[PDB]
Amino acid sequence: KRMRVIREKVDATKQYDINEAIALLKELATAKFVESVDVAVNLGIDARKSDQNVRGATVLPHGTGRSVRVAVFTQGANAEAAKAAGAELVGMEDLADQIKKGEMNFDVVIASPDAMRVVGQLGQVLGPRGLMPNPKVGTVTPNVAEAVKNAKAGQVRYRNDKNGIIHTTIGKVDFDADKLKENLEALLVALKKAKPTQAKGVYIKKVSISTTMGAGVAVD
Amino acid sequence: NPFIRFEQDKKLFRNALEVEGLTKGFDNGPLFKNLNLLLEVGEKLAVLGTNGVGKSTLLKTLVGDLQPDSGTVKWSENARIGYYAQDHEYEFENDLTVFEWMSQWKQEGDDEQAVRSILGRLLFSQDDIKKPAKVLSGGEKGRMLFGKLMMQKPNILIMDQPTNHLDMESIESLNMALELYQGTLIFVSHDREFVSSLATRILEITPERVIDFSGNYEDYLRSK
Amino acid sequence: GIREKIKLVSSAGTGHFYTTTKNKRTKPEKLELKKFDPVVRQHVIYKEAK
Amino acid sequence: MLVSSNVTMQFGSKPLFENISVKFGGGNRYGLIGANGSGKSTFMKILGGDLEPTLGNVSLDPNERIGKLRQDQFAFEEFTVLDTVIMGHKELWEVKQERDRIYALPEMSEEDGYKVADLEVKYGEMDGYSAEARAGELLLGVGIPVEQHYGPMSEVAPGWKLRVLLAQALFADPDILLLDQPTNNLDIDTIRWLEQVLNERDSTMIIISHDRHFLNMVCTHMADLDYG
RNA sequence: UUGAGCCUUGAUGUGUAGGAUAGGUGGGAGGCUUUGAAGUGUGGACGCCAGUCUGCAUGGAGCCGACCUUGAAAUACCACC
Numbered sequence: 001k002r003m004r005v006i007r008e009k010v011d012a013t014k015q016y017d018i019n020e021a022i023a024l025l026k027e028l029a030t031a032k033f034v035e036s037v038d039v040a041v042n043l044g045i046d047a048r049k050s051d052q053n054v055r056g057a058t059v060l061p062h063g064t065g066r067s068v069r070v071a072v073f074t075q076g077a078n079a080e081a082a083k084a085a086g087a088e089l090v091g092m093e094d095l096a097d098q099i100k101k102g103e104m105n106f107d108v109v110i111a112s113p114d115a116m117r118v119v120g121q122l123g124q125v126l127g128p129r130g131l132m133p134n135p136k137v138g139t140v141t142p143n144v145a146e147a148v149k150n151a152k153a154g155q156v157r158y159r160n161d162k163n164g165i166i167h168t169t170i171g172k173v174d175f176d177a178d179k180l181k182e183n184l185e186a187l188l189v190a191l192k193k194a195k196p197t198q199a200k201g202v203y204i205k206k207v208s209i210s211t212t213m214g215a216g217v218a219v220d
Numbered sequence: 221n222p223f224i225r226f227e228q229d230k231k232l233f234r235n236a237l238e239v240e241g242l243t244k245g246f247d248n249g250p251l252f253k254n255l256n257l258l259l260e261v262g263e264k265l266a267v268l269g270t271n272g273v274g275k276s277t278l279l280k281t282l283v284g285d286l287q288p289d290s291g292t293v294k295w296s297e298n299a300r301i302g303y304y305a306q307d308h309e310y311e312f313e314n315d316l317t318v319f320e321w322m323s324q325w326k327q328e329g330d331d332e333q334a335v336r337s338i339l340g341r342l343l344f345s346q347d348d349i350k351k352p353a354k355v356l357s358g359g360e361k362g363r364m365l366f367g368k369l370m371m372q373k374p375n376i377l378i379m380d381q382p383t384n385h386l387d388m389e390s391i392e393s394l395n396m397a398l399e400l401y402q403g404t405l406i407f408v409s410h411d412r413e414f415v416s417s418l419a420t421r422i423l424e425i426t427p428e429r430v431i432d433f434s435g436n437y438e439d440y441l442r443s444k
Numbered sequence: 445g446i447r448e449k450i451k452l453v454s455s456a457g458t459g460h461f462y463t464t465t466k467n468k469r470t471k472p473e474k475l476e477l478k479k480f481d482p483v484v485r486q487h488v489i490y491k492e493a494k
Numbered sequence: 495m496l497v498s499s500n501v502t503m504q505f506g507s508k509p510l511f512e513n514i515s516v517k518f519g520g521g522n523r524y525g526l527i528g529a530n531g532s533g534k535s536t537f538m539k540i541l542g543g544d545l546e547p548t549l550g551n552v553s554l555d556p557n558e559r560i561g562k563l564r565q566d567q568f569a570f571e572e573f574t575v576l577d578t579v580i581m582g583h584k585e586l587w588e589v590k591q592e593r594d595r596i597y598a599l600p601e602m603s604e605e606d607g608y609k610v611a612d613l614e615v616k617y618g619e620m621d622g623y624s625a626e627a628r629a630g631e632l633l634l635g636v637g638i639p640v641e642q643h644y645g646p647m648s649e650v651a652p653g654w655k656l657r658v659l660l661a662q663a664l665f666a667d668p669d670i671l672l673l674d675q676p677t678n679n680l681d682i683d684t685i686r687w688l689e690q691v692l693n694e695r696d697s698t699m700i701i702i703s704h705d706r707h708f709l710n711m712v713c714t715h716m717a718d719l720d721y722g
Numbered sequence: 723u724u725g726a727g728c729c730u731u732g733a734u735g736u737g738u739a740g741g742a743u744a745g746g747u748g749g750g751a752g753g754c755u756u757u758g759a760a761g762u763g764u765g766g767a768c769g770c771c772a773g774u775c776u777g778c779a780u781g782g783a784g785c786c787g788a789c790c791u792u793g794a795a796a797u798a799c800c801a802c803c
């Protein structure tokens with residue numbers, strides 16, 4: 001019904017405007033859910049090359065809309081500082097072999113360079129899903145107190161697929177339209193700032209905000 | 221075309237092989253059960269079969285390296301066995317040179333000449349023999365082991381898989397060299413023309429019965 | 445004749461080379477001599493090149 | 495969509511092939527033939543880029559993948575069958591060895607802190623998390639049974655050892671320098687099998703075998719290296 | 723008649739281990755269904771041959787999802803390729 005009626009109503013041949021796209025995105029209201037709407041930007045890079053990859057984290061002014069269960073696998077003083085940041089884990093392997101063995105998973109991974117234990121504890125289970133924080137992405141950092149607050153602040157993470165297109169959470173329908181636009185501008189600027197140096201050609205080609213349960217509309 | 225020929229030293233007269241029951245298997249069903257065998261001074265005995273059925277493990281335990289649960293293989297009174305293993309890499313080690321490596325293999329010939337000629341007969345120039353014997357490649361590794369049996373003069377020969385890296389001209393020379401050879405050799409080859417033209421007494425290996433003898437190998441396939 | 449030309453390029457990083465002749469048929473390996481490099485004014489190793 | 499270039503090599507007196515100038519590209523498979531002890535193996539060993547020639551004509555194409563089966567078919571009696579196939583991806587293997595020094599290291603350093611993260615993020619970027627499984631399906635696809643997947647290569651028949659070594663080469667590469675002299679695998683059955691695999695695969699491959707008949711069914715061009 | 727490029731749509735893509743011929747990125751666990759269903763018979767096409775598949779009314783309104791071995795989740799869903 002909706003999936004066969006949203007097709008004719010909204011046409012993909014024409015490219016829309018930013019202000020209209022947020023309005024049509026909330027216009028649907030067909031599926032009653034949290035509806036964390038999102039955007040997939042066709043980055044222009046050659047993902048076949050290891051030097052053109054884009055992989056980083058940035059913070060949005062309004063947040064992700066959900067608090068990730070950021071366990072802190074940093075043994076030592078990081079655990080003491082990270083205990084007041086709202087983390088559901090301590091710095092040790094206890095939450096990775098017995099806690100993390102039969103347990104399902106956390107939300108985010110806070111890494112401490114002083115402990116090379118959770119690196120192999122996750123292995124093909126906690127790392128095979130990519131939940132391991134990259135050392136250059138701030139997931140594993142020299143400190144643990146500063147990252148914990150920023151992690152709860154909405155430090156979204158974004159990576160290319162095999163083709164080189166990036167899509168990561170920007171907000172929910174519950175957020176007002178003006179908030180989403182600033183959230184979109186936060187991603188694009190940091191994405192454009194972190195765009196690599198061996199990137200021939202036009203970088204951003206397609207930007208299309210999409211509904212979690214609905215459709216997606218081109219923006220520029 | 222390298223010129224190789226094998227000549228005997230004592231030439232046993234009655235027979236060479238004597239196998240009662242082999243029953244050798246490494247970690248699965250044994251590759252052969254009894255394999256009663258006799259050679260009778262000739263009978264170039266082309267062992268055959270698809271790869272992975274254990275023709276190389278038969279020859280390895282036929283020469284006495286791998287101990288079988290058999291009852292000995294009972295070589296002849298004055299057998300001089302020459303071995304050309306399927307894999308030949310332990311010989312080409314310890315960074316001996318081409319001239320050095322060839323030299324130790326001899327019994328009565330002189331060290332300077334009569335080994336340069338044998339080594340140089342199979343296409344080894346003057347400057348080619350002053351380089352390490354481990355840096356050789358492919359056919360030259362094989363060609364050394366043909367020269368190895370030149371001076372050794374092995375009365376009884378094996379030649380596990382001789383025509384492996386040879387360049388379609390050494391194969392014609394090797395095929396001609398074994399053709400006029402007097403004596404016994406027990407080789408296992410995978411191609412058809414080398415086995416067909418060269419004298420043969422077939423012993424094919426398939427699970428479980430080891431078929432023995434059909435004549436020319438132009439009749440072994442003709443019987444099919 | 446059979447003796448061809450080579451150049452011993454310095455190892456001190458600067459571009460300096462002594463040019464000589466070397467027979468390759470007898471010896472196919474490189475040449476290593478400690479010579480004088482006027483650019484840095486020191487005795488350094490000169491590995492064969494070209 | 496790229497091609498290769500020219501080289502020149504010499505291991506002593508009387509240099510070997512003296513200013514070769516050729517190009518390999520397209521889909522056609524250049525069957526490379528030659529007499530014993532003359533270029534061939536070491537000519538395309540240079541082409542692989544692991545060792546450089548003397549005259550140094552150079553032949554570069556550093557963007558796409560090269561998979562190379564070699565002549566030393568017994569060069570690994572130790573590595574388990576799954577490890578040899580995985581090692582066909584050069585970047586994955588070298589990364590893992592320096593990564594695998596985690597359980598063998600009883601003490602970690604400060605600089606090791608982000609180093610282990612730097613190697614792990616490279617592991618996930620080229621998805622080494624499926625290399626054992628990705629090879630296993632391919633390894634099973636070339637005829638090797640499951641029960642010998644984890645066994646050592648010392649206890650694998652040399653005829654079977656080529657089926658593993660060809661699976662190592664086939665690792666999604668649009669060219670292969672095949673040193674495959676089908677020496678051990680001459681069952682005709684296995685020979686006929688290898689003729690189908692290469693024929694129905696589109697690559698700018700090179701074959702070196704001495705088998706006159708085998709070169710008929712597969713190769714389209716010949717690159718004889720005989721005189722100089 | 724036949725090659726080459728481009729747009730549009732639809733189809734399309736396992737062994738290891740299962741309820742199943744699951745492409746990748748993970749946003750999410752509630753959508754779907756009667757702008758006619760579960761199952762029923764009826765035909766293409768494809769098919770490491772079990773099946774995907776969609777013209778078809780009747781039958782008429784329950785199926786899916788989470789879980790489960792797995793390196794990985796699931797045509798439950800939509801989008802960017």
Ligand SMILES: Nc1ncnc2c1ncn2[C@@H]1O[C@H](COP(=O)(O)OP(=O)(O)OP(=O)(O)O)[C@@H](O)[C@H]1O
Pocket residue numbers: 246247270271272273274275276277278306648649650651652653654678679
């Ligand atoms: N040391 C060993 N341990 C376990 N299994 C072995 C061992 N040596 C051989 N085998 C197995 O027993 C059989 C004997 O094979 P072998 O290595 O003797 O060569 P082959 O069967 O004659 O092969 P080809 O014709 O390819 O040379 C094979 O199935 C092999 O996998």
Ligand SMILES: Nc1ncnc2c1ncn2[C@@H]1O[C@H](COP(=O)(O)OP(=O)(O)OP(=O)(O)O)[C@@H](O)[C@H]1O
Pocket residue numbers: 348355356357358359360385504505506529530531532533534535536537565
């Ligand atoms: N490291 C080396 N340095 C100098 N010359 C060498 C070196 N290795 C080999 N050679 C010379 O190059 C020749 C060619 O060796 P190569 O490995 O190319 O064999 P090939 O001609 O391909 O033989 P086959 O067909 O039997 O495989 C050798 O016979 C030897 O004389």
Ligand code: NA
Pocket residue numbers: 274275276277306651652
């Ligand atoms: Na064998």
Ligand code: NA
Pocket residue numbers: 357358534535536565
């Ligand atoms: Na070679």
